[PDB]
Point group: D3
Chain length 166, copies 6
């Protein structure tokens, strides 16, 4: 009955995002997780495709004890009109009641559309910038990710990709 | 890890689709399920949104004891260029090895891109199809019996029947 | 304070549409008039451009005693996602309270978004099909339109266009 | 019938734009006013929607005794191809004879398409510009005095100040 | 320098299109050839991609001794606004003076933009048309005889007959 | 038949690009030349339209005795998804075997799709580059000497220098 929504680039999905997700799941029955900027891939800032991130999330949420009945994973391309983005999200998702975001634009867009909006319950070393930097510089990127996500990154040759792009 | 792909409108997701899915899951480790024509909603032929169909699939696959580790559910908008549609799918999905489709165009597009392609292991009859489901929703027939219960619950929540009747 | 919305192709704007508009203006303070399928032009069914129809409406509503403070005229291209069309309209228009339409799809889309929806107060010989047929067959198309709209059609060579296209 | 064209973001519509418009109306019979970058809203640089700006213009031009027969107000989304933007404008507008712009790109695009192009008859200073208006909305300065009253009423109704402050 | 323009789907490029092109080249210095509906491929009506048709035209025009200095080959996707299509063409092509088309819509769109418009100098019969070519590809008829040999070679390389049969 | 691919903005087409093209033509039977960022025109960085650049390439390659049977010229608009760009190119071009690029992104995108990728055989200096050409157009320098004469003629016809100065 009570459904939350979370949106992030997740480039890549790391232990931080997972902690936040589990924390949100203590307050809602179900969580809709949107992969934002689904159109961006193959850059230093945004290395992975939508599909690759769907894979990461799907595998990570399965490998941790979260029942499938409690979440949805949805890629969302950015669009040119901010005034349409909430409609875009709504079309691509189940009905939802509350939005979790610390981003002022996301907050205000959802808020103007009449949604309840609140900051994530947790703020997280576990950041995507650090993960990507470590992938580039042969640091310990693996320890920042769930093992299921490292397996995705090995399969898709994520490290080699990001190094070539740099 | 052997990964299949299936693509369909699923307007709505019915017991036929589910039967096909379970059959495919006997021959692959994981199945990527794409919801095609994700852009189309609010017509007699295509009543439900991408999001509504994501919900239907997610609930149905969960209610039937298929482990979450064995599937992916991905909305896919149609595009103008057929020659690009396979690239579009690939961008939106995990890597995959084999495509299941009875549709000649889908087959040929994937085959030209070097994918293994086969027909679905099962073919369901017209009486269990989306057309029959939608017709029964319109005419007060027994649409519920053609769907998994978890999907009927989605349709009740979103007022699907009222929608389709108004649109007609 | 109370604002209505009306949407139509208006190919072209005829006396019928004007009658409906004046009738709606007895029930609302302001009327937002959307020119639908703004992208379609240069066919038998849809001969005129968005701009040409903006012109027709702007001139017709000015030539009749309707104060400028009581209406807005807005071209609206169709989009691929029905579930986004109401958001599309909202982005392009002032805030509004009630929608006037006899079209089941328009009704249901607006209704699902929480808007009050009602049929036009008047139903109208004055139809666009008749107007276009008369333009093609040298009938009396002029008598079906406000004079300000006929002047637009003369300036843009509307009759010659539609005849060449046929 | 001599018809001018003007194009601007008008984020928001201020007394400067209005002054320019009235000056242009001394030398043309009718003025087509295009709201550029109609797609951009909900940023510090571009806070208001196309619709909100249509409202602002419609109300402001009405409140200043400019007859409705003398202008057109048209939202125009930007497009990726500069070489097509003039065609895009032409499709969305009545026929026109002369373009008023101080912007080199706008000038050149219209000039290459064979239109007469001239600079606006008036140039307003920075202190009356959209940047100053938005800055004052953010910093609790006197933004109201830079706008026609009809535009301030739009901004109150849509909670423009609260929006821009939250976005910052 | 007098420059003509021609626009067609060319699904595929056949001897008829070539005949028309050569006739136009008697009356202009250079001919801009646009491949219309460049977005459509992999249907019975529109089997070949933009790229495949570029290949067909490029090969056919080179095999028939038409100097390269006399033509341009340009893929053009359809767009949703008819009132923008001429601007779309203009952006994608060299400057041009005259448009060759028998199609009322194409004629009127170009004409409203101030271009001189005229019908093609030659009309080929249905028996030599793309519809006949495609039908023969499907039904194992003599499709090859309706195409320049360079185009047949393209169709063999890209497995065009196998494609259209599967579809 | 061994077919190479090259992709560049070519704003405008200069002697450097031509030198590279001729070097590539020693190693392949045919070269597909894509005009990238075909959507961008009327800026200081990207002054010329797709059509104008098609004209430049078509004229330059014909003026230098490269037979028409050895190349294809294809405008290619950028797209928002990098993961789709190779599919976009493939749709718009003949089949090809090898990609020539020094750009890491272009290399990796093509490489991930299974194409052989190699750097161009020749690198020209900054002094002969598009940036230098455009700068000289702006500052009344000797831009003409950096271009094939056929390209200069295009630029005169389309009033390219006047455009870039106004911008
Ligand atoms: N018109 C449109 O298309 C439109 C409009 C609005 C938003 N969007 C999209 O919506 C998405 C969401 O916006 P966003 O700004 O939140 O995306 P984002 O790129 O994920 O930005 C969030 C930033 O804050 C960090 N962060 C997020 N949650 C955190 C937490 N609980 N604790 C600590 N740090 C946290 C992230 O770190 P990590 O990188 O490590 O995760 C990231 O650096 C974006 O893709 C944006 O493009 C699109
Ligand atoms: N360029 C592009 O964007 C592009 C190109 C190719 C395909 N696509 C998209 O790909 C999606 C799938 O294509 P499609 O042709 O398969 O469309 P579809 O809408 O999924 O329809 C296929 C038809 O076959 C039926 N069917 C499917 N599997 C069956 C089975 N095992 N036994 C019996 N009947 C079965 C479906 O029945 P039900 O009515 O019961 O579902 C439906 O009637 C569509 O959204 C299509 O638009 C897009
Ligand atoms: N996803 C999308 O983009 C989307 C979704 C929904 C709707 N739309 C668009 O929204 C627009 C509105 O839909 P619509 O079906 O109402 O458009 P429409 O094409 O104007 O259809 C209305 C039809 O009913 C007639 N009519 C309208 N009001 C009447 C009245 N009061 N009395 C008698 N007859 C009347 C019209 O006659 P006349 O021709 O003489 O005016 C016309 O034949 C369309 O352009 C449609 O494409 C778009
Ligand atoms: N390809 C495309 O889609 C394309 C191509 C060309 C142009 N456009 C669009 O066309 C629109 C207009 O272009 P623009 O360069 O004029 O943008 P703009 O946003 O209207 O800005 C022009 C700048 O000049 C100021 N200004 C305008 N008229 C003035 C006057 N009379 N005196 C003093 N200052 C004046 C404006 O001030 P204020 O801040 O006070 O308004 C603004 O700071 C924009 O939306 C642009 O994006 C689009
Ligand atoms: N808004 C837009 O995007 C827009 C607007 C207008 C036109 N267009 C596009 O422009 C392109 C051209 O339009 P079109 O109407 O000419 O389409 P087309 O499909 O290229 O030609 C129409 C028919 O005429 C035949 N034909 C052409 N030249 C002939 C000749 N000289 N003698 C005998 N038959 C001849 C063709 O034969 P074959 O079958 O043998 O080829 C075809 O059957 C199309 O791709 C269309 O989609 C786009
Ligand atoms: N998602 C997408 O749409 C996508 C993805 C990747 C790439 N692209 C497009 O693909 C095109 C090509 O990419 P690019 O990075 O190669 O861009 P580019 O702008 O064509 O070239 C980049 C720079 O390298 C220079 N250069 C090229 N070849 C050279 C050589 N042999 N020797 C010396 N300098 C040389 C160019 O010189 P000049 O200035 O003299 O030309 C230019 O300054 C672009 O249009 C890009 O936008 C698009």
């Amino acid at each position: 009955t009570m459904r939350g929504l979370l949106v992030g680039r997740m480039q890549p999905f790391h232990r931080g995002h997972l902690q936040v997700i589990k924390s949100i799941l203590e307050e809602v029955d179900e969580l809709i997780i949107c992969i934002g900027s689904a159109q961006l891939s193959h850059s230093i800032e945004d290395p992975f495709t939508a599909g690759e991130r769907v894979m990461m999330l799907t595998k990570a949420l399965s490998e941790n004890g979260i029942p499938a009945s409690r979440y949805y994973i949805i890629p969302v391309q950015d669009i040119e009109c901010n005034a349409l983005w909430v409609g875009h999200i709504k079309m691509l998702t189940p009905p939802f009641d509350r939005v979790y975001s610390g981003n002022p634009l996301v907050q205000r867009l959802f808020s103007e559309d009449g949604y309840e909006v609140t900051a994530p319950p947790l703020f997280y070393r576990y950041s995507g910038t650090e993960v990507r930097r470590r992938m580039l510089d042969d640091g310990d990127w693996r320890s920042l990710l769930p093992e299921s996500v490292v397996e995705v990154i090995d399969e898709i040759n994520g490290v080699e990709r990001i190094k070539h792009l740099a």
